[PDB]
Amino acid sequence: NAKFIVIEGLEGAGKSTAIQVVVETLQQNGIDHITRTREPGGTLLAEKLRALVKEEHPGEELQDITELLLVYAARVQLVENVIKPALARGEWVVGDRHDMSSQAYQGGGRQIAPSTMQSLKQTALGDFKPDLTLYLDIDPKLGLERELDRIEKMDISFFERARERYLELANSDDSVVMIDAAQSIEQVTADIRRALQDWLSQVN
Amino acid sequence: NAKFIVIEGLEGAGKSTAIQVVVETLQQNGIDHITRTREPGGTLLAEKLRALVKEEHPGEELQDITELLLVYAARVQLVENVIKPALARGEWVVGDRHDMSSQAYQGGGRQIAPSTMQSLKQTALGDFKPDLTLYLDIDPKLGLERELDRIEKMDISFFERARERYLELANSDDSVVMIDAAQSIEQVTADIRRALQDWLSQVN
Numbered sequence: 559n560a561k562f563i564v565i566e567g568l569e570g571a572g573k574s575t576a577i578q579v580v581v582e583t584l585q586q587n588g589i590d591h592i593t594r595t596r597e598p599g600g601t602l603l604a605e606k607l608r609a610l611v612k613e614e615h616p617g618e619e620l621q622d623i624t625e626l627l628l629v630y631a632a633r634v635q636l637v638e639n640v641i642k643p644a645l646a647r648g649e650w651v652v653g654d655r656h657d658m659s660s661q662a663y664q665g666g667g668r669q670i671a672p673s674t675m676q677s678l679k680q681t682a683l684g685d686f687k688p689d690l691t692l693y694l695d696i697d698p699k700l701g702l703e704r705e706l707d708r709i710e711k712m713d714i715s716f717f718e719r720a721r722e723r724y725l726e727l728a729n730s731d732d733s734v735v736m737i738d739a740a741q742s743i744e745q746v747t748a749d750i751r752r753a754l755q756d757w758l759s760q761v762n
Numbered sequence: 763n764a765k766f767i768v769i770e771g772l773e774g775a776g777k778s779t780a781i782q783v784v785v786e787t788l789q790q791n792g793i794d795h796i797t798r799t800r801e802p803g804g805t806l807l808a809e810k811l812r813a814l815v816k817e818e819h820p821g822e823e824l825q826d827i828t829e830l831l832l833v834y835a836a837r838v839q840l841v842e843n844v845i846k847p848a849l850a851r852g853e854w855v856v857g858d859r860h861d862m863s864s865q866a867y868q869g870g871g872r873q874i875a876p877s878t879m880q881s882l883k884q885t886a887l888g889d890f891k892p893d894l895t896l897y898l899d900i901d902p903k904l905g906l907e908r909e910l911d912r913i914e915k916m917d918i919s920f921f922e923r924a925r926e927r928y929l930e931l932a933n934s935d936d937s938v939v940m941i942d943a944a945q946s947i948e949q950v951t952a953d954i955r956r957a958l959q960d961w962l963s964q965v966n
């Protein structure tokens with residue numbers, strides 16, 4: 559049965575090579591219909607919104623609530639127009655970021671009230687969630703070391719708050735598996751392959 | 763003391779000439795610092811979002827929740843970056859549409875749940891509201907008769923639902939004054955001038 563697998567983590571955790579290993583592992587397990595997505599983005603409108611979030615806004619203060627609304631608008635478009643239909647056709651979906659990123663960056667980083675984050679999540683997504691999330695955990699500075707956009711230019715305390723939120727969620731959500739991304743690409747890759755293989759072997 | 767006056771109504775009710783009469787009336791009453799706004803829009807980002815809402819989306823279904831989020835994102839930017847600062851400087855603000863339009867079009871027209879509309883309003887605006895709203899009431903067909911965008915191309919039942927919501931709000935909100943916009947421009951203009959003059963004469 560079709561599943562939604564998400565790859566998560568701070569800047570430079572290694573989500574790009576992780577997606578590679580996840581797709582390859584799925585293929586090795588006989589899954590031959592897979593759709594990758596990335597957030598924010600993945601549709602014409604969502605990509606326009608991604609640009610609005612990543613670009614600088616000279617002469618205009620981009621309010622925290624506005625940022626949240628934009629990433630959610632992009633997510634709704636992707637979920638309704640790409641992800642759900644793909645799952646419905648029987649394709650597995652592998653996402654480069656999903657809602658956990660809003661929780662970490664907008665909730666932890668921007669410090670938006672938890673009541674606000676949950677009511678917006680409910681409004682946008684209902685109970686829709688990934689089946690497995692592979693959270694690549696990394697010290698923010700180390701990840702940054704690996705033309706910065708508006709968010710990447712935030713001070714490190716923002717990313718520390720984001721990491722704190724990611725870790726809380728990884729610890730409370732049984733569907734989140736944490737990977738130590740501070741290792742060599744080879745070891746991280748090996749741990750991802752194992753965690754996913756281990757998880758696939760327990761479905762049903 | 764600085765006040766926020768909003769002009770509301772369906773397509774073609776006559777909001778453009780109404781704004782004219784409102785600003786002129788304020789000036790005649792010694793108010794010499796006034797900032798007009800229009801929604802969605804009024805900032806660089808808000809204008810980009812206005813275009814996204816008004817433009818067609820070939821090959822992509824624009825979800826109802828997405829539309830709501832976009833108009834709210836535009837509103838937050840305008841309220842925080844233009845309206846509130848203007849009021850704070852002592853300028854009166856005259857808006858061409860505001861939140862009542864979301865209630866009518868997204869709430870009534872798109873039929874978004876009331877719980878969703880209120881939680882999003884609270885999230886975006888808190889208790890911020892206009893001091894006076896002049897709602898220009900018109901039969902939708904008559905107003906349409908007076909290159910249509912994506913919303914203007916909706917069937918008339920959408921606008922009837924929007925009118926129904928506008929009227930409910932006009933009837934429940936003491937700060938909303940309803941004007942019969944089905945009259946000649948001269949008579950509508952005269953009624954607006956009177957309603958505003960009557961209202962100004964009762965402040966404090």
Ligand SMILES: Nc1ncnc2c1ncn2[C@@H]1O[C@H](COP(=O)(O)OP(=O)(O)O)[C@@H](O)[C@H]1O
Binds near residue numbers: 568572573739746
């Ligand atoms: N475990 C690792 N050790 C060292 N470098 C890495 C590791 N994982 C990724 N990188 C490098 O860091 C950079 C960003 O990786 P990327 O996968 O794009 O990160 P993300 O998508 O999480 O921002 C790339 O140049 C990549 O080669």
Ligand SMILES: Nc1ncnc2c1ncn2[C@@H]1O[C@H](COP(=O)(O)OP(=O)(O)O)[C@@H](O)[C@H]1O
Binds near residue numbers: 773775944
């Ligand atoms: N009371 C009225 N009677 C007849 N025509 C009107 C009236 N009010 C406005 N119009 C006309 O309808 C058109 C749209 O008016 P406008 O003020 O732009 O409407 P809105 O901004 O509410 O969409 C204009 O050509 C205007 O001249």
Ligand SMILES: Cc1cn([C@H]2C[C@H](O)[C@@H](COP(=O)(O)OP(=O)(O)O)O2)c(=O)[nH]c1=O
Binds near residue numbers: 598629630661710
């Ligand atoms: C999905 C999502 C991403 N973001 C941020 C995380 C990233 O900084 C950015 C997405 O870009 P990113 O995934 O870093 O792409 P790249 O590796 O090419 O820079 O958007 C949010 O702030 N909120 C969200 O909901």
Ligand SMILES: Cc1cn([C@H]2C[C@H](O)[C@@H](COP(=O)(O)OP(=O)(O)O)O2)c(=O)[nH]c1=O
Binds near residue numbers: 860863
């Ligand atoms: C402010 C706002 C406007 N709208 C709609 C109402 C209008 O159809 C459109 C704004 O354009 P409109 O005010 O009609 O400008 P013009 O007279 O130049 O066409 O956006 C919403 O659907 N939701 C909102 O929250």
Ligand SMILES: [Ca+2]
Binds near residue numbers: 569710
């Ligand atoms: Ca980045």
Ligand SMILES: [Ca+2]
Binds near residue numbers: 573574
């Ligand atoms: Ca990446």
Ligand SMILES: [Ca+2]
Binds near residue numbers: 591592593649
């Ligand atoms: Ca496919």
Ligand SMILES: [Ca+2]
Binds near residue numbers: 562688
């Ligand atoms: Ca699911």
Ligand SMILES: [Ca+2]
Binds near residue numbers: 729730731
């Ligand atoms: Ca636990």
Ligand SMILES: [Ca+2]
Binds near residue numbers: 727730731733734735
């Ligand atoms: Ca867990």
Ligand SMILES: [Ca+2]
Binds near residue numbers: 773914
């Ligand atoms: Ca219009």
Ligand SMILES: [Ca+2]
Binds near residue numbers: 777778
């Ligand atoms: Ca107008």
Ligand SMILES: [Ca+2]
Binds near residue numbers: 795797853
């Ligand atoms: Ca001014």
Ligand SMILES: [Ca+2]
Binds near residue numbers: 766890891892893
């Ligand atoms: Ca006020």
Ligand SMILES: [Ca+2]
Binds near residue numbers: 933934935
């Ligand atoms: Ca009443």
Ligand SMILES: [Ca+2]
Binds near residue numbers: 932933934936937938
């Ligand atoms: Ca009233």
